Specification:
Chains B, D: It comes from Bacteroides fragilis. Chains B, D: It is found in: Cytoplasm. Chains B, D: This is CRISPR type III-B/RAMP module-associated protein Cmr5. Chains B, D: Keywords: Antiviral defense, Cytoplasm. Chains B, D: InterPro entries: AF1862-like_dom_sf, CRISPR-assoc_prot_Cmr5. This is part of a larger assembly, with one copy of chain A, two copies of chain B and one copy of chain C. Chain A is an alpha+beta fold. Chain A has a four-stranded antiparallel beta sheet with strand order 3-9-1-10, with helices on one face. Chain A has a four-stranded mixed beta sheet with strand order 2-8-4-5, with helices on one face. In chain A, helix 1 crosses helix 2. Chain A is globular and about 75 Å long. In chain B, helix 1 packs across helix 4 and helix 3 packs antiparallel against helix 6. By secondary structure, chain B is an all-alpha fold. The longest helix of chain B is centred in the C-terminal third of the chain and has 19 residues. Chain B starts with a helix and ends in a 5-residue tail after the last helix. Chain B is built from seven helices and no strands. Chain C contains nine helices and twelve strands. A five-stranded antiparallel beta sheet of chain C has the order 2-4-7-1-12. Chain C has a three-stranded antiparallel beta sheet with strand order 10-9-11. Chain C has a two-stranded antiparallel ribbon with strand order 3-8. The chains are: A alpha+beta, B mainly alpha, C alpha+beta. Chains in contact: A-C, B-C, B-D. Chain C binds one RNA strand through loops.
RNA sequence: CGCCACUUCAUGGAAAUAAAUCACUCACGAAUAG
């Protein structure tokens, strides 16, 4: 056969930039290159080059010398045009009372972009408002135009079609073999690594697909980690509630991984931090690295406890580390590169900002090396090893002080660029591990062999069942 | 349209002057595509867009792509050097300043047809002169 | 001027996209490196792009009605949402921010977006077995190419016309008659003026409740996954837009393995020796059905492997 | 432009010399079109652009199109020989060096009137002499 | 729970390639000489 007409199911909503069309669905611009890479990787039995030679011999390549592209036609079309449109933010806000049926809110999500659309601004989709009965418990209002002008919407549709056309039959047979694994392994969308890309294929050519998610995850990923989330009754009602629990749990766990949780009242240390301070106990935080020089001049930061040193115990040290010295590297770069760090000064009146750049303009990006896969309400955390190109590379930190003023006849103006004149530790303050030069000798596979085994009472912080490790 | 041998001579001299033809009479292979793309952009988009695109030096391209605009200016200067007094009353015979931006020169001088004809002449001359050489 | 692109009050879309696009305003800079990245240039190009994508086309538009009168009845299909892209390789960029970096195909006189008939001809022929020339750099690809295309076109022909058996020679003759209007081995056939397959320019015919043009992003993430991707802006034909495909097709007569004209086929039929097992016919209606099935299978335009320019029935 | 038999023999020798005619008296079929189109290119585009187009070796041509320029140079050189050398003769009986390409020679030596006539007659002789061989 | 952004905005390839390069007809006809 020359055509593959697959019907696939949506598990988690997709964040789509071109949502203004009712025909908005999966973009094959993401599927086709990733599917080509996956197919060639499977052809070479794990190696992309061997698979490229395989496709070269069988004449499946558009070009035999330049690129990875395979010769087939990808088409993704919606069968039923009804869409469930979601608003995705980072914080939790009161729900509106007047609300279209298509509109649901996944408030506590890893996707932290477009956080200002739930503000008091006139350009916010849901405008917050003071309550009259209680001078708390903010009120919610819905603006139709603002919801129409949003950059990105979380969309969920019914079963739709992905059509694969080629005149090469053997390529179609191998595509049929590997497509369920491809969709079970890859996520598509914005912040898709955190779970806004989850799809599974149900019917391939009008035939049901018995493809075990666990086995495919075991095959194509270095480590696969299952977490059984307590589905409190329901399971037949409020898929919105299910999504809220799932994404709040993901935000919980991933904030636990590379950072702490200074929220309500319970403190659990960053396991990314705890890994480096334990293995060869020299590498410490970039955050504590940053906060050290801010207090080197008079600038009191909000908080009651000093920055953490040591793996355990309730120790605090707003003082010298030790007579010898300490190792500082950009620990949080490997689990997702960041650019700008806000530090909350004691007075709300101003902020302090640290901004990061490659210091030679090489590493401007790093997608998180973790992938979150949610299939039929079960949470799986997967990942290969990190990219070693990020290891041992310096960075240049810009220290700025920013202040805001309360209206006075115009409005908010968070504009002060005093450009903090902190003394610098100096590049090459030590051998080239001082303040920069992302830490050498990291291992993601052993990082999660370490991450979810911690804390008193014996309960896993991330109550994950280790599947492949 | 017929390209004069004098125009080809000016193109050869300009290609050698703005370090495009090496001392071995060879040029990088990408410059032929550069010149063809410049001609296509000039006819399709216009003089201002094409000249702005190919005058850029922050372009991450595989070679010094502003060199064709430099060669263009050199050819036009050589063309304007041999203008007669009869031509100088109708045509702008002034020599284009070396440091001066070619796009800025075109814009400040309007969008006159004279500059468009000169640019097209020099582009075709660059094409032929590059064809005269070997591409290593 | 605003919606409802008409011959009375509307700017030429091609003129806006190519000529008026890079116009010099008193306080707009895109010559220097600072100007191209500034938000003033971004706002200028945003306003231009809004003007481009603020036009609608009515079903009863006099332009499309004139097209229907000139080119016969149209074959109306609908646009899926990748969008539709044609003339993508045309040079349109200056290095600025917020501008369309890709070319678009606009009719010069009308300004309506269109697909040149050459594109339709090439796309339709690309799934016929003899769309590849031997040359000598093709030699390796040629055998497999013809085989798969023969099987595909054979199933399509058995689908669309009441013929239960076709051959490779018959497929060759049919393809050459349809596209080259000749024989596979050079020499021509004395065809009538009507007996000639013409592929007109496909036109946008109806933007029902929205505009016909949209703006879209392709972001090629580099071969270095640690460097910043490139957002590329371009102009696409909106989904759910009626594209009129105009053809002038005839009825093809195949006796034995050769293509016959109507004048020859009349005498062949009247000959005392005849074989209905050797006389094959493909009606112009069945030819249009074949072309429609090909178009539904593969689509039209650029980035079709990515999906752009795929159709359903209207 | 009557058929000049001596130029026909020159064309035969030059066609054999620049590896166009095989040992069996056959040539690549595309060369017919090359010879036919060279004259039109010279007339309606100019001698230098036509020579540059046909002298290029970076072409996407089905055969070695640059061989015809070498044959042209050989015919021209043969005509420079057997020139009646006298004080009154306009014709320059100086042979074109093999290291110089044909485009450079006309560029450096700026008396095109002789070169144009010689190139036109040599192209006519080329086209007339190519017909003695099989058009494979 | 409260607050909040910075990024990135075209490169590489194809730049014409083949077919036909004149064909057929007329190439002197009458008158004046014998």
């Amino acid at each position: 056969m020359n055509q593959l007409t697959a019907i696939l199911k949506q598990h988690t909503p997709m964040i789509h930039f071109q949502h203004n069309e009712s025909g908005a669905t999966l973009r094959a611009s993401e599927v086709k290159p990733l599917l080509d890479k996956f197919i060639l990787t499977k052809l070479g039995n794990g190696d992309i080059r061997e698979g490229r030679l395989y496709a070269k011999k069988n004449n499946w390549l558009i070009d035999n010398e330049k690129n990875y592209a395979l010769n087939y036609k990808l088409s993704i079309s919606l069968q039923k045009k009804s869409r469930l449109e979601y608003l995705i933010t980072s914080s939790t806000f009161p729900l509106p009372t007047e609300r279209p049926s298509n509109f649901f809110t996944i408030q506590n999500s890893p996707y932290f972009a477009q956080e200002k659309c739930v503000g008091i601004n006139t350009n916010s989709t849901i405008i917050l408002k003071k309550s009259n009965s209680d001078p708390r418990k903010k009120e919610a209002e819905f603006k139709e135009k603002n919801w129409s002008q949003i950059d990105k919407k979380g969309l969920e549709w019914q079963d739709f079609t992905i059509k694969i056309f080629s005149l090469k039959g053997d390529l179609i047979n191998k595509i049929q073999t590997y497509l369920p694994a491809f969709f079970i392994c890859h996520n598509f969308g914005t912040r898709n690594n955190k779970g806004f890309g989850s799809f599974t294929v149900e019917y391939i050519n009008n035939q049901k697909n018995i493809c075990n998610v666990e086995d495919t995850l075991k095959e194509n990923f270095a480590f696969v980690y299952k977490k059984k989330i307590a589905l409190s009754r329901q399971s037949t009602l409020d898929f919105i509630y299910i999504y809220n629990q799932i994404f709040s749990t993901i935000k919980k766990d991933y904030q636990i991984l590379k950072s702490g949780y200074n929220f309500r009242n319970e403190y659990i240390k960053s396991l990314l931090f705890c890994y480096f301070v334990s293995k060869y106990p020299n590498y410490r935080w970039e955050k504590r690295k940053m906060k050290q020089l801010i207090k080197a001049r008079g600038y009191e930061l909000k908080g009651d406890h000093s920055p953490i040193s040591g793996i355990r115990e309730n120790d605090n040290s707003w003082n010298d580390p030790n007579p010898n010295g300490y190792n500082y590297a950009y620990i949080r770069a490997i689990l997702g590169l960041a650019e700008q760090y806000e530090f909350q000064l004691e007075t709300p009146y101003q902020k302090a900002i640290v901004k990061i750049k490659s210091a030679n303009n090489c590493i401007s990006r790093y997608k998180s090396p973790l992938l979150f896969k949610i299939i039929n309400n079960s949470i799986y955390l997967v990942g290969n090893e990190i990219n070693t190109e990020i290891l041992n590379k310096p960075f240049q930190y810009s220290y700025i002080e920013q202040t805001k003023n309360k209206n006075m006849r115009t409005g908010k103006s968070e504009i002060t660029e005093r450009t903090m004149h902190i003394n610098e530790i100096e590049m090459n303050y030590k051998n080239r591990i001082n303040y920069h030069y992302t830490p050498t000798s990291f291992s993601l596979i052993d990082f999660m062999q370490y991450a979810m085994s911690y804390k008193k009472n014996g309960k896993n912080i991330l109550n994950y069942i280790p599947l492949k490790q | 349209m017929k390209i004069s041998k004098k125009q080809i001579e000016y193109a050869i001299e300009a290609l050698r002057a703005n370090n495009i033809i090496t001392n071995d009479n060879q040029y990088p292979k990408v410059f032929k595509g550069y010149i063809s793309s410049f001609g296509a952009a000039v006819i399709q988009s216009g003089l201002i867009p094409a000249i702005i695109f190919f005058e850029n030096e922050d372009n991450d391209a595989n070679a010094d792509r502003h060199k064709i605009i430099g060669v263009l200016k050199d050819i036009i200067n050589a063309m304007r050097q041999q203008y007669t007094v009869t031509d100088a009353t109708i045509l702008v015979s002034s020599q284009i300043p070396a440091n001066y931006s070619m796009a800025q020169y075109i814009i400040e001088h309007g969008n006159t047809d004279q500059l468009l004809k000169e640019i097209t002449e020099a582009a075709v001359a660059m094409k032929l002169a590059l064809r005269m050489y070997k591409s290593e | 001027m605003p919606k409802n692109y008409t011959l009375q009050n509307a700017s030429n879309l091609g003129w806006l996209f190519y000529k008026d696009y890079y116009r010099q305003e008193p306080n707009v800079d895109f010559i220097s490196t600072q100007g191209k990245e500034s938000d003033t240039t971004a706002d200028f190009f945003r306003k231009t792009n809004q003007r481009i994508t603020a036009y609608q086309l009515n079903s009863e538009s006099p332009l499309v009605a004139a097209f229907n009168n000139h080119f016969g009845t149209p074959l109306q299909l609908k646009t899926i949402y990748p969008g539709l892209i044609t003339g993508s390789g045309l040079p349109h960029q200056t290095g600025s921010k917020g501008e369309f970096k890709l070319g678009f195909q606009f009719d010069y006189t009308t300004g309506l977006p269109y697909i040149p008939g050459s594109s339709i001809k090439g796309t339709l022929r690309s799934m016929f077995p003899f769309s590849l020339k031997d040359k000598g750099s093709t030699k390796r690809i040629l055998p497999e190419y013809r085989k798969e295309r023969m099987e595909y076109i054979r199933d399509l022909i058995i689908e669309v016309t009441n013929i239960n058996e076709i051959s490779d020679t018959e497929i060759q003759a049919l393809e050459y008659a349809i596209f080259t209007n000749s024989t596979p081995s050079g020499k021509t056939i004395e065809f009538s003026l009507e007996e000639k397959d013409v592929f007109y320019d496909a036109f946008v015919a109806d933007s029902k409740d929205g505009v016909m043009l949209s703006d879209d992003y392709i972001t090629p993430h580099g071969e270095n996954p640690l460097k910043d991707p490139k957002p590329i802006l371009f102009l696409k034909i909106r989904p759910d837009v009626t594209i009129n495909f105009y053809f002038k097709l005839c009825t093809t007569h195949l006796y034995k393995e050769k293509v016959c004209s109507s004048k020859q086929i009349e005498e062949i039929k009247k000959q005392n020796d005849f074989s209905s097992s050797d006389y094959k016919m493909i009606t112009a209606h069945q030819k249009r059905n074949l072309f429609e099935k090909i178009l539904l299978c593969i689509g039209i335009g650029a980035k079709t492997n990515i999906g752009y320019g795929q159709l359903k029935k209207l």
